[PDB]
Enzyme design. Sequence first.
Site, PDB file in Angstrom:
ATOM      1  N   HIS A  44      15.091 174.599  28.404  1.00  0.00           N
ATOM      2  CA  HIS A  44      15.876 173.388  28.195  1.00  0.00           C
ATOM      3  C   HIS A  44      15.806 172.402  29.355  1.00  0.00           C
ATOM      4  O   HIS A  44      14.982 172.523  30.255  1.00  0.00           O
ATOM      5  CB  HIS A  44      17.294 173.830  27.828  1.00  0.00           C
ATOM      6  CG  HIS A  44      17.945 174.542  28.966  1.00  0.00           C
ATOM      7  ND1 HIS A  44      17.572 175.813  29.306  1.00  0.00           N
ATOM      8  CD2 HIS A  44      18.948 174.180  29.834  1.00  0.00           C
ATOM      9  CE1 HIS A  44      18.307 176.199  30.363  1.00  0.00           C
ATOM     10  NE2 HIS A  44      19.140 175.201  30.731  1.00  0.00           N
ATOM     11  N   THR A  47      12.525 168.070  29.015  1.00  0.00           N
ATOM     12  CA  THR A  47      11.165 167.672  29.342  1.00  0.00           C
ATOM     13  C   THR A  47      10.514 168.653  30.290  1.00  0.00           C
ATOM     14  O   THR A  47      11.158 169.256  31.161  1.00  0.00           O
ATOM     15  CB  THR A  47      11.159 166.249  29.899  1.00  0.00           C
ATOM     16  OG1 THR A  47      12.157 166.169  30.955  1.00  0.00           O
ATOM     17  CG2 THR A  47      11.454 165.220  28.831  1.00  0.00           C
ATOM     18  N   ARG A  48       9.175 168.729  30.118  1.00  0.00           N
ATOM     19  CA  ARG A  48       8.290 169.540  30.931  1.00  0.00           C
ATOM     20  C   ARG A  48       7.019 168.762  31.246  1.00  0.00           C
ATOM     21  O   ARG A  48       6.508 168.056  30.389  1.00  0.00           O
ATOM     22  CB  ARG A  48       7.885 170.873  30.266  1.00  0.00           C
ATOM     23  CG  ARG A  48       9.055 171.813  30.021  1.00  0.00           C
ATOM     24  CD  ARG A  48       9.449 172.523  31.321  1.00  0.00           C
ATOM     25  NE  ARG A  48      10.566 173.452  31.203  1.00  0.00           N
ATOM     26  CZ  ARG A  48      11.862 173.169  31.108  1.00  0.00           C
ATOM     27  NH1 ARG A  48      12.261 171.913  31.057  1.00  0.00           N
ATOM     28  NH2 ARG A  48      12.747 174.135  31.131  1.00  0.00           N
ATOM     29  N   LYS A 264      14.655 161.906  36.079  1.00  0.00           N
ATOM     30  CA  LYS A 264      15.017 163.286  36.248  1.00  0.00           C
ATOM     31  C   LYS A 264      14.214 163.887  37.380  1.00  0.00           C
ATOM     32  O   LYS A 264      13.007 163.663  37.521  1.00  0.00           O
ATOM     33  CB  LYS A 264      14.697 164.055  34.964  1.00  0.00           C
ATOM     34  CG  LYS A 264      15.002 165.549  34.968  1.00  0.00           C
ATOM     35  CD  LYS A 264      14.503 166.223  33.664  1.00  0.00           C
ATOM     36  CE  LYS A 264      13.995 167.585  33.947  1.00  0.00           C
ATOM     37  NZ  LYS A 264      13.415 168.124  32.684  1.00  0.00           N
ATOM     38  N   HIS A 268      11.487 172.303  43.489  1.00  0.00           N
ATOM     39  CA  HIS A 268      10.719 173.428  42.983  1.00  0.00           C
ATOM     40  C   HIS A 268      10.733 174.642  43.906  1.00  0.00           C
ATOM     41  O   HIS A 268      10.753 175.774  43.424  1.00  0.00           O
ATOM     42  CB  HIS A 268       9.257 173.009  42.773  1.00  0.00           C
ATOM     43  CG  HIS A 268       8.332 173.995  42.153  1.00  0.00           C
ATOM     44  ND1 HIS A 268       8.621 174.652  40.974  1.00  0.00           N
ATOM     45  CD2 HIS A 268       7.114 174.402  42.535  1.00  0.00           C
ATOM     46  CE1 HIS A 268       7.573 175.419  40.647  1.00  0.00           C
ATOM     47  NE2 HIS A 268       6.643 175.295  41.592  1.00  0.00           N
ATOM     48  N   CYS A 314      18.583 176.055  34.871  1.00  0.00           N
ATOM     49  CA  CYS A 314      17.518 176.749  34.179  1.00  0.00           C
ATOM     50  C   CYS A 314      17.009 177.867  35.066  1.00  0.00           C
ATOM     51  O   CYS A 314      17.457 177.956  36.218  1.00  0.00           O
ATOM     52  CB  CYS A 314      16.488 175.656  33.912  1.00  0.00           C
ATOM     53  SG  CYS A 314      14.955 176.076  33.029  1.00  0.00           S
ATOM     54  N   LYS A 347       3.787 174.315  29.980  1.00  0.00           N
ATOM     55  CA  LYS A 347       2.635 173.512  29.558  1.00  0.00           C
ATOM     56  C   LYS A 347       1.575 174.343  28.846  1.00  0.00           C
ATOM     57  O   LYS A 347       0.814 173.814  28.028  1.00  0.00           O
ATOM     58  CB  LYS A 347       2.035 172.742  30.740  1.00  0.00           C
ATOM     59  CG  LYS A 347       1.367 173.659  31.787  1.00  0.00           C
ATOM     60  CD  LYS A 347       0.891 172.971  33.064  1.00  0.00           C
ATOM     61  CE  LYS A 347       2.010 172.504  33.979  1.00  0.00           C
ATOM     62  NZ  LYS A 347       2.721 173.642  34.570  1.00  0.00           N
TER      63      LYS A 347
END
EC number: 1.5.3.1
Length: 381
Positions: A44, A47-48, A264, A268, A314, A347
Site C-alpha cells: 500500500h 505508488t511504486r 510523496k 530507504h 509499510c 516493480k
Amino acid sequence: THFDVIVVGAGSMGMAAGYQLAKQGVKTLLVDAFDPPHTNGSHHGDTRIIRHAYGEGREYVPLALRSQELWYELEKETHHKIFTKTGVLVFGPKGESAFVAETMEAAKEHSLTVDLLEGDEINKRWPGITVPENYNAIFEPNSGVLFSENCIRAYRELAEARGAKVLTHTRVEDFDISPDSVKIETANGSYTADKLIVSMGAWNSKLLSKLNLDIPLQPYRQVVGFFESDESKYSNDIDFPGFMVEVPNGIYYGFPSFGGCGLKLGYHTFGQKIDPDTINREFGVYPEDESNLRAFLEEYMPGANGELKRGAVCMYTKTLDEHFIIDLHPEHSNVVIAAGFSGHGFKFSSGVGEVLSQLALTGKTEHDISIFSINRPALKE
Ligand SMILES: *Cc1cc2c(cc1C)nc1c(=O)[nH]c(=O)nc-1n2C[C@H](O)[C@H](O)[C@H](O)COP(=O)(O)OP(=O)(O)OC[C@H]1O[C@@H](n2cnc3c(N)ncnc32)[C@H](O)[C@@H]1O
Ligand SMILES: O=C(O)[C@H]1CCCN1
Ligand SMILES: [Cl-]
C-alpha cells in the site's frame, strides 16, 4: 478443497502468480490473512517506482524489462490505472555513490535510454530540485510509476473471473508436505493441492520455520509522507519525475504529485526492526517518521515541504545480501518460495508471478534466477 495449486499470501507476488496460473486454466486457491489489496502488508501507499537501469545490480535488468511489458499488458486488460511514465531520476554526489554508478553501468550494459546531467543542469531541467554543483544524475525517461494497489486488484479480478478462488481473512497456521501433495491448515478448514507457492511477505520471517527453513529475514517498518507542494513545479502534469537518490546520510525515493495529492517521499536506508504482528502502523508515532523526510525536502526539494497531507506505514523484508529468494524448497520440489524482497520487489511482481507459475507447474523457469537461489552462501549468517 483440493486444487492444482495453492498460493499462501495473495499479495504482490502471490496475486500475480494466481493471475498467471488462472490464465492457463490451472485451478488455483489463493489464501490471504486479509482482503488484498490491503494496508497491513508491503503493497500500500498507492505508488511504486519501476526502474530498468538497476542500481542494486545490472543482473535484474531482464526481469525489469519483462515486468514492464507485463504491466503494459495489464493496463490493456483492466479499467484500473496501472502505470504512468513519469521517468525516474537518480542522482548523488559525483564519485561518492555506488547506487548511481551501478545505475549508469547497467544502462550502458543493456543499451537503455537515459540522459546524463550534472550540477545546475539538474536544477534547470526540473525546477524545484536544488542539488549542489558536485552532484551528477542519470534520468531514465521511459520508466515510471505503478499504482500498486490497483495492480493487485486488477490481477485479482482477472484471476477470479477465470476461476481462481480467493479465501480472505484466513490465516494459514501450518503446513503438511508429502511427496505427492501439499496441505495447509487454517481456522476455516484445511486445503490440499499438487503444488504450493509460499509468498507471505513480512510473515515469511515468522512462518517459514513451519516448512523446516532457517533463513535470516528481517522485517523493517518503512514510512512515507505526502506533502503539500508547489504544483507548478512538482506535479506529474509538468513532468516532475519519480526519483531514487543517494545523499551522504542515505537513500531517499519519491513521486511527483498526482492530481494534487502532494509529493510523496520515503527514506530507504533507515527503518525500525519490527515483527509484523506487533508493528505500530500509525504514521508519526516516532519523531523520525516526519523529521527524516523534511530534512531531505528542505535541502533538495524545498517547495515540496508544506503541510503533511497523508502518511503510511509499510514493511520491507530484508535478506542479508538484499537480493530476493525465488526458488524451490530444497527438500520439496512441489513447494515454491518467494521471499525477502528487501524493499525493491514490487516493480518485478508481474515477472515474478510468471516465474512462480513456471516453477510450480514444471519445476523450472525460462528466466535466469540463479542470483535468487535459496541455497546461496550470502543468505546465511
Ligand atoms: C513498504 C514499502 C515497500 C516498497 C516501497 C516503499 C515502501 C514503503 N517502494 C518500492 C518501490 O517504489 N518499488 C518497488 O519495486 N518496491 C518497493 N517496495 C517493496 C515492495 O512493495 C515489496 O518488495 C513487495 O510488495 C513485496 O511483496 P510480497 O508479495 O512479498 O508482500 P505482500 O504484498 O505484503 O504480500 C504478502 C501477503 O501475505 C499475506 N499473508 C501473510 N501471512 C499469511 C498467512 N499466515 N496466511 C495467509 N496469508 C498470509 C498478507 O496478508 C499479504 O497479503
Ligand atoms: O524499489 C525501488 O524502486 C526503491 C523505492 C523505495 C524502495 N526501493
Ligand atoms: Cl520487501
